[PDB]
Scaffold this active site. Sequence first.
Site, short mmCIF file in Angstrom:
data_model
loop_
_atom_site.label_atom_id
_atom_site.label_comp_id
_atom_site.label_asym_id
_atom_site.label_seq_id
_atom_site.Cartn_x
_atom_site.Cartn_y
_atom_site.Cartn_z
CG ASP A 4 -4.46 6.78 -9.41
OD1 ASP A 4 -3.70 6.13 -8.68
OD2 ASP A 4 -4.04 7.63 -10.21
CE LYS A 32 -5.08 10.11 -7.22
NZ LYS A 32 -3.83 10.13 -6.42
CD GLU A 84 1.59 5.02 -10.36
OE1 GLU A 84 1.54 6.28 -10.43
OE2 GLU A 84 1.83 4.43 -9.29
N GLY A 144 4.80 15.43 -2.13
CA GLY A 144 5.22 14.94 -0.84
C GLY A 144 6.31 15.80 -0.21
CG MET A 145 10.38 18.35 -1.24
SD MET A 145 11.77 18.21 -2.36
CE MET A 145 12.70 19.65 -1.91
CE1 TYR A 193 -1.05 20.27 -0.99
CE2 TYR A 193 -3.28 20.99 -1.49
CZ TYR A 193 -1.98 20.75 -1.89
OH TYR A 193 -1.60 21.01 -3.14
#
EC number: 2.7.1.33
Lengths: 273, 273
Positions: free
Chosen positions: B6, B13, B70, B122-123, B137
């Site tokens: 994915d 992933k 997806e 993402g935000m 992250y």
Amino acid sequence: MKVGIDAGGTLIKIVQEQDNQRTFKTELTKNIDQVVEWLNQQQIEKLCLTGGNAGVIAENINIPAQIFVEFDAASQGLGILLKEQGHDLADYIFANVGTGTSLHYFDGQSQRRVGGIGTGGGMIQGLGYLLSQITDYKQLTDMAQHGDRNTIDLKVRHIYKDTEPPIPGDLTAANFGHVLHHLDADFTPSNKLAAVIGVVGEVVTTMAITVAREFKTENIVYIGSSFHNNALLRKVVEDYTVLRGCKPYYVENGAFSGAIGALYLEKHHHHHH
Amino acid sequence: MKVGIDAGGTLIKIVQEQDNQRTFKTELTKNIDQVVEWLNQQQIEKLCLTGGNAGVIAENINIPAQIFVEFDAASQGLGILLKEQGHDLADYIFANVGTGTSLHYFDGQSQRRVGGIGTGGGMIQGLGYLLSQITDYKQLTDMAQHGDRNTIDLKVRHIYKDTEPPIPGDLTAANFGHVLHHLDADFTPSNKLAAVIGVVGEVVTTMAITVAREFKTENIVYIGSSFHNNALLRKVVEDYTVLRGCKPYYVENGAFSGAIGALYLEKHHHHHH
Ligand SMILES: Nc1ncnc2c1ncn2[C@@H]1O[C@H](COP(=O)(O)OP(=O)(O)O)[C@@H](O)[C@H]1O
Ligand SMILES: Nc1ncnc2c1ncn2[C@@H]1O[C@H](COP(=O)(O)OP(=O)(O)O)[C@@H](O)[C@H]1O
Ligand SMILES: CCCCCCCNC(=O)CCNC(=O)[C@H](O)C(C)(C)COP(=O)(O)O
Ligand SMILES: CCCCCCCNC(=O)CCNC(=O)[C@H](O)C(C)(C)COP(=O)(O)O
Ligand SMILES: [Mg+2]
Ligand SMILES: [Mg+2]
């Protein structure tokens, strides 16, 4: 002289009624003592109050007051404004984009609150301040209008690239999701502020269209002072409402719905059986 | 060796299946060439691909590939994981909080997409970077966990003060709406980041509970890599889901739903009539 006041989280909205004509005034909630000063210079028999800070005005002046719940006051004043402005809608969602956002379904007779979210005008100001150090509302909103969101927001087509996406490629995939792809960009205050207005508008509109679908109405009426001096916000909301097959409405003086509603509710509270 | 991938907007992933056992791997989408390097060192007869970047992997390697959409792949892999983990749900909303957020109603048989919003992982990263200059992250999310939102977010009780409010006083009235009331505060990176996670969680959960009500299910399953290393986000979402009378579910390896789903769909694509 009758007076309706919607004393909200950020602005106090005043509707002075003198012989078949409204006079509209605003004051910052921060300056609520100056509203009391003003009231003390008028000849007013009764205050018709609503909003979270109504109790503060009532406590601090010796003019009789009656308080109305803001959701009913807003609905009623909005119903009056819509009819004055030539809109005879059978039903609608209304989204009150104030300090925060409250969403209501009006079925033709009464309102019920169907959701809410903390994305609204307060976020525009507060997150705007963190990203730009601007405190002045006019300066902040003016700066935002022509900001470019492209280096900040990620669209669906950025993820899917040459593959046809399963939802429209122009849609925002991630607010602020392009920032890490543009770490050498000049993130200008204008661009950052446009992206703040963008995410607020997108969240509001997404929630409004969702509840419009749930409650089977195509009409969505947008009110609140958050739209004042913010043509960008108006456009973000109008465009995405239309895209999702709903009809957006903006109302002249819609931000004064609650104050108008308080005056009306007071007037019609006097009946007997 | 069979492989499901994915390839999403931020993370790729990978589920490697070797004789009755999954091996899970992640790589940054930025590093998609390193996934291709890895694949070229394996003995793989076929790739089962999904996600926006699937086409990029398929174009860049000479192993046969089949691509799945997806939304169906995620739904199918999630259905497998739920049953493995002892959840036999008749229906549910699932909220896929990836780079952005996609919301689906699963009626017991199939999924349909019922909304989405650009508030997601993402935000968290991008707005987090603008407010903290942190790009890593783990560092970003670790910093956020113990941030104090109180000087940044405005609650309903801050607006209504001594008046009983028309909705619960503890609710967020305005994300970032307290910033202008605390202009002399130290807005620490931790506090700012907690408020970013807060608004993302609140928007996601609000949309999920709204569509749960619309589609008449009390179950809400939350998946996506945005929850990884972010116990605060998990708590914001879990707490508000429970408050609104829904049952939240988190799934071990739920972020790999799509990859698992791609392997399953490939397997069952081979039938005849
Ligand atoms: N002159 C102004 N000063 C500050 N905020 C303003 C002004 N004009 C419009 N606004 C915007 O309107 C929002 C408040 O909307 P409003 O409907 O009056 O809310 P409330 O009822 O909570 O006071 C502010 O958060 C801001 O985004
Ligand atoms: N190691 C990591 N690196 C970067 N982001 C991460 C990592 N782990 C979790 N995330 C979070 O997960 C989000 C991506 O979620 P995911 O479900 O994989 O999305 P997508 O399918 O769009 O790649 C990121 O935006 C971030 O918030
Ligand atoms: C902790 C879980 C967070 C869930 C909170 C998210 C939902 N919040 C809400 O529904 C409140 C949104 N805000 C509003 O409805 C309004 O700002 C309100 C509190 C009614 C005050 O009216 P205004 O001053 O006119 O904005
Ligand atoms: C311009 C009007 C703005 C309206 C856009 C707001 C709605 N946006 C969306 O519904 C897309 C939200 N994002 C998603 O669904 C996912 O991020 C998606 C684009 C499907 C990609 O999947 P992921 O990489 O797994 O997040
Ligand atoms: Mg208000
Ligand atoms: Mg994904």
